[PDB]
Motif scaffolding. Structure first.
Motif, PDB file in Angstrom:
ATOM      1  N   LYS A  54      17.058  -4.298 -12.941  1.00  0.00           N
ATOM      2  CA  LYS A  54      16.568  -5.637 -12.630  1.00  0.00           C
ATOM      3  C   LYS A  54      15.302  -5.589 -11.813  1.00  0.00           C
ATOM      4  N   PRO A  55      14.390  -6.555 -12.036  1.00  0.00           N
ATOM      5  CA  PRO A  55      13.125  -6.626 -11.305  1.00  0.00           C
ATOM      6  C   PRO A  55      13.472  -6.711  -9.825  1.00  0.00           C
ATOM      7  N   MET A  56      12.643  -6.143  -8.959  1.00  0.00           N
ATOM      8  CA  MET A  56      12.979  -6.172  -7.556  1.00  0.00           C
ATOM      9  C   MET A  56      13.277  -7.560  -6.993  1.00  0.00           C
ATOM     10  N   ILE A  57      12.470  -8.554  -7.370  1.00  0.00           N
ATOM     11  CA  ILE A  57      12.655  -9.899  -6.841  1.00  0.00           C
ATOM     12  C   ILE A  57      14.016 -10.531  -7.123  1.00  0.00           C
ATOM     13  N   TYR A  58      14.712 -10.018  -8.129  1.00  0.00           N
ATOM     14  CA  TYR A  58      16.033 -10.501  -8.476  1.00  0.00           C
ATOM     15  C   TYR A  58      16.966 -10.343  -7.291  1.00  0.00           C
ATOM     16  N   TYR A  59      16.706  -9.338  -6.467  1.00  0.00           N
ATOM     17  CA  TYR A  59      17.573  -9.102  -5.341  1.00  0.00           C
ATOM     18  C   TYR A  59      17.426 -10.109  -4.201  1.00  0.00           C
ATOM     19  N   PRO A  60      16.225 -10.250  -3.614  1.00  0.00           N
ATOM     20  CA  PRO A  60      16.170 -11.236  -2.539  1.00  0.00           C
ATOM     21  C   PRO A  60      16.621 -12.607  -3.021  1.00  0.00           C
ATOM     22  N   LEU A  61      16.279 -12.944  -4.250  1.00  0.00           N
ATOM     23  CA  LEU A  61      16.647 -14.222  -4.832  1.00  0.00           C
ATOM     24  C   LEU A  61      18.160 -14.436  -4.826  1.00  0.00           C
ATOM     25  N   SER A  62      18.908 -13.453  -5.307  1.00  0.00           N
ATOM     26  CA  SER A  62      20.369 -13.538  -5.371  1.00  0.00           C
ATOM     27  C   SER A  62      20.994 -13.843  -4.014  1.00  0.00           C
ATOM     28  N   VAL A  63      20.341 -13.368  -2.962  1.00  0.00           N
ATOM     29  CA  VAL A  63      20.819 -13.608  -1.615  1.00  0.00           C
ATOM     30  C   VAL A  63      20.802 -15.125  -1.373  1.00  0.00           C
ATOM     31  N   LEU A  64      19.624 -15.738  -1.544  1.00  0.00           N
ATOM     32  CA  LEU A  64      19.467 -17.178  -1.367  1.00  0.00           C
ATOM     33  C   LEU A  64      20.496 -17.914  -2.224  1.00  0.00           C
ATOM     34  N   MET A  65      20.744 -17.422  -3.424  1.00  0.00           N
ATOM     35  CA  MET A  65      21.716 -18.085  -4.279  1.00  0.00           C
ATOM     36  C   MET A  65      23.128 -17.927  -3.737  1.00  0.00           C
ATOM     37  N   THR A 105       0.764  -1.253   0.000  1.00  0.00           N
ATOM     38  CA  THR A 105       0.000   0.000   0.000  1.00  0.00           C
ATOM     39  C   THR A 105       0.800   1.312   0.000  1.00  0.00           C
ATOM     40  N   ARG A 106       1.981   1.319   0.609  1.00  0.00           N
ATOM     41  CA  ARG A 106       2.777   2.533   0.673  1.00  0.00           C
ATOM     42  C   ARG A 106       3.311   3.041  -0.662  1.00  0.00           C
ATOM     43  N   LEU A 107       3.191   2.235  -1.705  1.00  0.00           N
ATOM     44  CA  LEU A 107       3.653   2.645  -3.032  1.00  0.00           C
ATOM     45  C   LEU A 107       2.399   2.767  -3.871  1.00  0.00           C
ATOM     46  N   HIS A 108       1.281   2.990  -3.201  1.00  0.00           N
ATOM     47  CA  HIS A 108      -0.003   2.928  -3.859  1.00  0.00           C
ATOM     48  C   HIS A 108      -0.471   3.400  -5.180  1.00  0.00           C
ATOM     49  N   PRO A 109      -0.329   4.662  -5.543  1.00  0.00           N
ATOM     50  CA  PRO A 109      -0.917   4.700  -6.892  1.00  0.00           C
ATOM     51  C   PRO A 109      -0.410   3.531  -7.809  1.00  0.00           C
ATOM     52  N   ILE A 110       0.895   3.236  -7.758  1.00  0.00           N
ATOM     53  CA  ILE A 110       1.546   2.200  -8.566  1.00  0.00           C
ATOM     54  C   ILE A 110       1.128   0.751  -8.332  1.00  0.00           C
ATOM     55  N   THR A 111       1.316   0.257  -7.107  1.00  0.00           N
ATOM     56  CA  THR A 111       1.001  -1.133  -6.758  1.00  0.00           C
ATOM     57  C   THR A 111      -0.477  -1.518  -6.852  1.00  0.00           C
ATOM     58  N   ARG A 112      -1.279  -0.608  -7.376  1.00  0.00           N
ATOM     59  CA  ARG A 112      -2.690  -0.872  -7.570  1.00  0.00           C
ATOM     60  C   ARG A 112      -2.742  -1.727  -8.814  1.00  0.00           C
ATOM     61  N   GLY A 113      -1.650  -1.723  -9.563  1.00  0.00           N
ATOM     62  CA  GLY A 113      -1.631  -2.477 -10.790  1.00  0.00           C
ATOM     63  C   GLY A 113      -0.740  -3.680 -10.769  1.00  0.00           C
ATOM     64  N   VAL A 114       0.533  -3.464 -10.480  1.00  0.00           N
ATOM     65  CA  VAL A 114       1.511  -4.537 -10.480  1.00  0.00           C
ATOM     66  C   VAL A 114       2.086  -4.755  -9.101  1.00  0.00           C
ATOM     67  N   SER A 115       2.486  -5.989  -8.808  1.00  0.00           N
ATOM     68  CA  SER A 115       3.089  -6.309  -7.522  1.00  0.00           C
ATOM     69  C   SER A 115       4.368  -5.518  -7.297  1.00  0.00           C
ATOM     70  N   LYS A 116       4.589  -5.074  -6.069  1.00  0.00           N
ATOM     71  CA  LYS A 116       5.799  -4.324  -5.695  1.00  0.00           C
ATOM     72  C   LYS A 116       7.097  -5.045  -6.072  1.00  0.00           C
ATOM     73  N   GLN A 117       7.092  -6.370  -5.961  1.00  0.00           N
ATOM     74  CA  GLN A 117       8.262  -7.173  -6.246  1.00  0.00           C
ATOM     75  C   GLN A 117       8.590  -7.314  -7.714  1.00  0.00           C
ATOM     76  N   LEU A 118       7.768  -6.751  -8.580  1.00  0.00           N
ATOM     77  CA  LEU A 118       8.065  -6.815  -9.999  1.00  0.00           C
ATOM     78  C   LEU A 118       8.613  -5.463 -10.441  1.00  0.00           C
ATOM     79  N   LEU A 119       8.520  -4.465  -9.568  1.00  0.00           N
ATOM     80  CA  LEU A 119       9.004  -3.130  -9.879  1.00  0.00           C
ATOM     81  C   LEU A 119      10.504  -3.131 -10.039  1.00  0.00           C
ATOM     82  N   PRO A 120      11.040  -2.137 -10.761  1.00  0.00           N
ATOM     83  CA  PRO A 120      12.480  -2.127 -10.937  1.00  0.00           C
ATOM     84  C   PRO A 120      13.400  -1.434  -9.950  1.00  0.00           C
ATOM     85  N   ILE A 121      14.506  -2.116  -9.655  1.00  0.00           N
ATOM     86  CA  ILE A 121      15.582  -1.568  -8.841  1.00  0.00           C
ATOM     87  C   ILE A 121      16.633  -1.445  -9.946  1.00  0.00           C
ATOM     88  N   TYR A 122      16.680  -0.270 -10.558  1.00  0.00           N
ATOM     89  CA  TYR A 122      17.561   0.035 -11.676  1.00  0.00           C
ATOM     90  C   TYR A 122      17.245  -0.726 -12.950  1.00  0.00           C
TER      91      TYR A 122
END
Ligand SMILES: Cc1cn([C@H]2C[C@H](O)[C@@H](COP(=O)(O)OP(=O)(O)OP(=O)(O)O)O2)c(=O)[nH]c1=O
Ligand SMILES: Cc1cn([C@H]2C[C@H](O)[C@@H](COP(=O)(O)OP(=O)(O)OP(=O)(O)O)O2)c(=O)[nH]c1=O
Ligand SMILES: Cc1cn([C@H]2C[C@H](O)[C@@H](COP(=O)(O)OP(=O)(O)OP(=O)(O)O)O2)c(=O)[nH]c1=O
Ligand SMILES: Cc1cn([C@H]2C[C@H](O)[C@@H](COP(=O)(O)OP(=O)(O)OP(=O)(O)O)O2)c(=O)[nH]c1=O
Ligand SMILES: [Mg+2]
Ligand SMILES: [Mg+2]
Ligand SMILES: [Mg+2]
Ligand SMILES: [Mg+2]
Lengths: 291, 291, 291, 291
Positions: free
Chosen positions: D32-43, D13-30
């Motif tokens: 790469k999709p955001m989820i690429y980051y937590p994933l890389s940690v596990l890897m 909700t804190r990123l709201h106008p945006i996340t009303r459409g797409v999941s926060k974890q698909l948004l970009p961190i430069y």
């Protein structure tokens, strides 16, 4: 016809490792020396006689950078403030200069920018008598000087460093006065901090009941570059709008030009000596037009 | 034991409206004067005797900011370069200083930063015989002096601003020389650009076959702050990693401390006089530990 | 009364690791979904009937985010472009929608912003007859479609990514057409790149002599967000002016409000559901005034 | 051999106008999709079996972007969390998946980065039994979950949203557990907010007295991208170090490669399909070496 003063001294302790060497007002806000900014304001207000007060140590550097101001079609005078005893002291130090005329003080670490600023400036500069100050909406109204008011402003209180409430309109480093100013200055007691605070002088005008208050609206940007982080915010801002929106902020030769202060010939000499610079091409480009 | 020199003069024309007043090397890279950076390098290389070459006009500003260097536990000497006649001239001007010992030249507008950098410096410093330059893969080879080399490096060639090809490794403003250095510089003639180029001194160790190359690998960052835009990139970078990753870049007192150059008592006098600064608290914080 | 279309499909390959999941037009430009920007333009042009063309896969995400548009007081219709066959195809796909009326096409990855923009849009909108494209002086003409013109504009030529010269004005992703538009698009053949180019539709109004050009002067900012770096520039820009100068760019409910498209009651329901957001407070704040 | 889970749902909700459409974890961190980051940690922790929990609406987008994970040489499983009822629920939802083995939970909106992180990770991943959490020094210890402790950490209190004191070590979205975890999860009461809070589960391990605490030192960067401003800080950070220091953060194919998870042939197929991208060239470049 009015006169302007620019406080360009101070110890600038909050930027310390750096300001141990060079004056804060010589530091860069992107591609222009910091002092270029407060100066441009006075020029946008149509003021050509400007006294720059600096420390004894930095003086030659300013002269070395600004000369007599003839390069920007303005008349620059210099004066030294021996020790950083406070802002109010500007009027004492600048008595002989101001003579008995009205004035405009602009702090040296202030950056101002908005669409249609020049007018707002001129209008307020059309006021013989009284005292106008420019407030700006801050989110941190504690660490900033606050001014209350209602219809016609007038201001009902100038609580600086409010211990708890007031309003959220901080007052900027852009002040306008009238003769009685050297007066109010001559009588001012050193603050707890220990310096003749300009706020004390503004206090008097409030009670005297002739302290109008100019409102800096939404599209206006205001910064007080005196900390490592705000110095960066300022630079990044100017760089962003200059490259993103195509105009230059605080480009003195350009302000003079339009003000009829210097002829195309003058602008061309400038743009030339800066030709290797983005500031210079911007100047060459103004020397023409498009379809 | 080796000696270091820092070229901190020049006309800095590419930052022109600004450098018309203050030397480029006094400008800020975030919260520290630019010169703080090349200096830290020499300190990370373990060099305490450092000659700073500046213009006659800026000298006192440097002294005013750095003093004799005792505050950072280093021995600073100053020398004036009358007119900006080129880089090779540093060895001429610095003859009496270097005496006959080996040296380390670092350009004043260079920012270096990476993990494991120091060890790499000490190793390259422990050499007594030859010459040592560092490469960094630029994306603008034209605009940089480039080094082509082969296995172990050596460098088959060194073309300046190669209007055409070469390799993509630019020669950074970090150099290590031996006694033969001052000998070379005296036989350098002015480039087409009219200055005495350091590249010439380098083309001499190339032929003599005594010219090793040190690669500034992946985790290292390198910048040549001499344009309005690169000055901002540099600032933004240091601010970002300092705030994001928690350490300070080019924090002299901290480098001295760990190098046993100055005692906790020394670091405390410093952090105190900077207490009102983020640089100061960073220093206070090093004066302890966590669980 | 005129109609508007927004191309919000495409494969967005240049932002690839990312656009492999979500459409480029759903990505964020600071605090708002990218599509919020081209849309605001149409609204500033006073257009309420808007067809959004998207891929079959992204559709529901757009609907999920924009609904029927009643929340912004506008009538939104959706249509799917099966495969990314080019821009001209919008008129084919949008025939039944446009019916026979005049239109306005805005690319989905374009950000526009300047003072006085709207009035300029209305004027260019009030035209019924011809075609209207906007130019913006790029620094990369090669990489952009360019318009050479003469007095009043007209445009003598329009070379695409001119491997050589032309002029330096790039054609922005903002266009105005009349009924003859759908006629043209049907006779466009695939470029060397394999897509049906909008430039072709434009080369047709050129010859017919019915092609006016509108110059996006100095105070205007223009970006084509379709690369990783330009996506960041865009974000940083909007964030900077919004925080620095106090207004919001592409704030739909606010545009609607002033356009009398939605009542205070409407704006309040919105600001509420966004209350936890800076976008929301900005809305609450418009629900009043200052002295 | 251990298993990993990634909470990639939430209403953001804190990123709201945006996340009303797409999941926060698909948004970009430069780039790469955001989820690429937590994933890389596990890897980087050497975990190949990973369950991604998402909302029913976003699922296909993640699958569309990550597939079965074979492209990164990992085994990805998906699971839907019907309604955003809290973090602890991950273990309930992921029971059948975890089976009875030990695990690693990483929040989807967390970015981690430091030199020699992988080791620190592995070591902690060598712990059968207990529970490790990673704390980070924050300046705003109120709006973050705090953890106290002494020699060996152990942790003496986990006061979240402390009403007033504690320590300043916030606990990040990187957790490690052991079997007893599905247990503790099954018994957890909804917080005031109204969601099964992971903090409640960590509480139990504290009293059970087997809640060790890993310390994320200075050179480590940590962010919780869930607000418009932090999303920008994150992007700008990654962009800065990637371009300034020459390496890529969270480049999955590269992490797999070195981990022997995928052969050069695999990396080449990837770099190819991204060739038009800076991410792709970075990959082509790893397919060789320098002198
Ligand atoms: C106090 C003082 C300030 N000034 C200038 C400095 C600034 O441009 C402006 C505002 O004062 P400040 O913003 O307070 O700057 P400063 O120089 O006092 O440094 P700091 O407070 O961080 O230690 O006024 C003078 O010119 N003379 C003075 O005696
Ligand atoms: C040419 C010259 C440079 N320097 C310094 C300045 C720089 O820090 C460094 C590199 O030179 P430059 O980076 O070329 O800087 P510059 O001062 O020549 O200014 P510009 O080229 O923009 O006009 O060497 C001297 O100290 N003495 C000199 O004669
Ligand atoms: C080609 C095409 C583009 N568009 C949209 C996408 C863009 O917002 C806009 C401009 O096209 P582009 O900016 O070219 O974007 P793109 O989606 O083609 O991706 P890329 O070139 O990087 O591979 O038009 C469509 O909606 N349908 C299409 O067939
Ligand atoms: C609450 C919750 C969060 N998550 C994810 C979302 C985040 O990546 C991460 C942390 O939760 P948050 O950071 O709180 O994110 P959020 O989705 O709750 O949105 P907000 O608080 O701003 O309204 O956990 C789930 O996967 N399922 C859930 O039920
Ligand atoms: Mg100040
Ligand atoms: Mg240089
Ligand atoms: Mg595009
Ligand atoms: Mg979060």
């Amino acid at each position: 016809h009015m006169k302007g003063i620019i406080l360009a001294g101070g110890s600038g302790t909050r930027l310390h490792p750096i300001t141990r060497g060079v004056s804060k007002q010589l530091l860069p806000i992107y591609d222009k020396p910091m002092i270029y900014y407060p100066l441009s304001v006075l020029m946008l207000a149509g003021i050509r006689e400007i006294l720059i007060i600096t420390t004894p140590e930095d003086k030659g550097y300013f002269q070395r950078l600004l000369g007599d101001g003839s390069e920007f079609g303005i008349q620059l005078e210099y004066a030294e403030q021996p020790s950083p005893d406070g802002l109010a002291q500007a009027f004492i130090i600048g008595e002989t200069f101001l003579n008995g005329e009205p004035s405009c003080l602009v702090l040296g670490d202030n950056i101002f920018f908005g669409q249609g600023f020049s007018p707002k400036l001129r209008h307020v500069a059309a006021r013989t008598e009284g005292a106008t100050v420019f407030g700006y909406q801050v989110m941190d109204p504690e660490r900033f000087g606050v001014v209350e008011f209602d219809d016609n402003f007038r201001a009902i209180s100038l609580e600086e460093k409010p211990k708890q409430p007031k309003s959220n309109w901080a007052v900027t480093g852009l002040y306008f006065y009238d003769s009685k100013v050297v007066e109010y200055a001559k009588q001012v007691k050193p603050s707890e901090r220990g310096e003749l605070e300009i706020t004390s002088i503004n206090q008097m005008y409030l009670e005297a009941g002739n302290l109008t208050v100019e409102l800096l609206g939404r599209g206006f940007a205001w910064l007080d570059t005196g900390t490592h982080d705000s110095l960066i915010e300022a630079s990044t801002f100017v760089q962003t709008v200059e490259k993103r929106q195509g105009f230059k902020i605080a480009c003195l030769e350009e302000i003079a030009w339009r003000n009829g202060w210097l002829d195309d010939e003058g602008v061309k000499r400038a743009a030339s000596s800066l030709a290797k610079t983005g500031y210079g091409q911007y100047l060459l480009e103004l020397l023409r037009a498009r379809p």
